[PDB]
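Annotators were shown the component list below and the corresponding predicted structure, then asked to write short factual statements about the assembly.
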Amino acid sequence: SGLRKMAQPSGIVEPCIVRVAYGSNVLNGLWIGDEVICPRHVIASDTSRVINYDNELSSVRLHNFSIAKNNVFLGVVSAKYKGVNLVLKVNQVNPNTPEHKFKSVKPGESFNILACYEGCPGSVYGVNMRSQGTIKGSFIAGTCGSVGYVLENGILYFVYMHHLELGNGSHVGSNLEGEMYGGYEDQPSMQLEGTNVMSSDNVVAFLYAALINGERWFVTNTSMSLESYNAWAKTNSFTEIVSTDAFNMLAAKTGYSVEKLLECIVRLNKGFGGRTILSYGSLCDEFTPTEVIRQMYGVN
Amino acid sequence: SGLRKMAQPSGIVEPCIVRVAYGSNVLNGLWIGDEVICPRHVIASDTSRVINYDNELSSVRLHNFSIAKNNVFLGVVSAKYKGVNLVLKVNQVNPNTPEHKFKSVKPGESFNILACYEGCPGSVYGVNMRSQGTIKGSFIAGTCGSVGYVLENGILYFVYMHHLELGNGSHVGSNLEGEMYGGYEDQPSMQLEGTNVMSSDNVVAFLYAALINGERWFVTNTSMSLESYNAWAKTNSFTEIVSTDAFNMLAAKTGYSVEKLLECIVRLNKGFGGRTILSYGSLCDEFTPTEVIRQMYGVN
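Structure shown to annotators:
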């Protein structure tokens, strides 16, 4: 039993991480095939002030890139912006390139961060995309270009590359096509995150995990209809539930309907009264139904 | 900024994981050199009742072990108990054996779990050893033999192998020498965990992490001497602080003395008053000083 936020194993991704430096900027790149993908601000003269990315590309020189993995030094033969990323053609193919695909994650979806520090994989942890396109991680100077990935059905997808932190501490990155999640600019200027909308699907999964774990104190002899919950969610910064299909197995195994748990959300959002659920002191929307089923039942 | 419980990358460990089955029992083994190490209960006829491990070894047959990694099947040529583990000599050397050492972790120390499901590495997360020798993870049937490890100064240490869950949900395992942490028996019978003693060193590190993060609401114009704190800790299920050396850098960078944070512990242990620190609702002892310095400053 137990519920922990996990990451999928990082081995397949680690050999793709390189150090990319330009001038005094140092970050990470993703070396796949004969390309290195990294955040384009590595070439900016001064990342502490608003950047004119036209001017930075105008004055770039390919020779000034310093890209390395251990004792392998990679020369840049072509450089393009692709959205907020640089795509750098290099003079060597990564012999450890894994089979892979690219996709974008959506709000409420979980994925893995390989946190890399000036070219060195340092740690791995799980995240969940928030409604405004942000994650709550732990990133510092030297960790841009850290890679997010997810394995599905034996297929490796690259889904995230790290770019910046907002003034409220939320973390912002892009897909590997260089589209920033949430639409944020790759600038140091103040950008607001709007209101965080909790993932109702994930809160339902969390309450199911507690029930699987034998923790049932919060369930009452009450239950809320789906339309009723959705009308409440729309004014309480929770998402509307569009389908209950993701909960069929959880409901069958625990014996608790989704609607009982919807009533629990509305009641518990007012506060836990000093109690905890799975050691949390308030509702948690970081776990998907899939994540809960996998770690608590060991299936799909 | 931010603080997350992380794991060190798992790639070096993943190629060492094998499926070990005997009869109807299925768990994981650690294949290093020409040895596979696994929990000895894989050979027990009925793990739901007290096991006479003499009787199970008496009736073992080497041919009945089924050990595999992908399309590699390993034959057992010798079997010994070493404490609560089996050490199995096999007929092939693991060509992906990493350089490694063995050591034991101590209460308050962090390490990484590679959670493995019937021979397949599934996920990786960080843990911290509790005073009674337990961890709070997420383990289910099929995950025994999952491996705990820590990288220090480029050296890989294997430190934990998973065996059982106590009635209160705490997780129990052994070192790779087969000594069970906490002294628990590898039996399904009720075993109590005594009182959990919080790691004061780690709580101090957690409060420093909050201060590094710019969260300072909980500090007051008060400070508690070291002997005074230790007398309080001894009757409040916290460890005594033996040395402040681990906090020199944290204190220098934040400007806050250890003694200010000791006063914070005594005050906050009575409750956070509905507030949070780094999103937690009560004090957290899962992070070491080293962990905080590494992820928040990127040093050693």
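Statements collected:
1. The helical segments of chain B are 53-58, 200-212, 226-234, 248-254, 258-268, 289-297.
2. Chain B touches chain A through 48 residues (CB under 8 Å).
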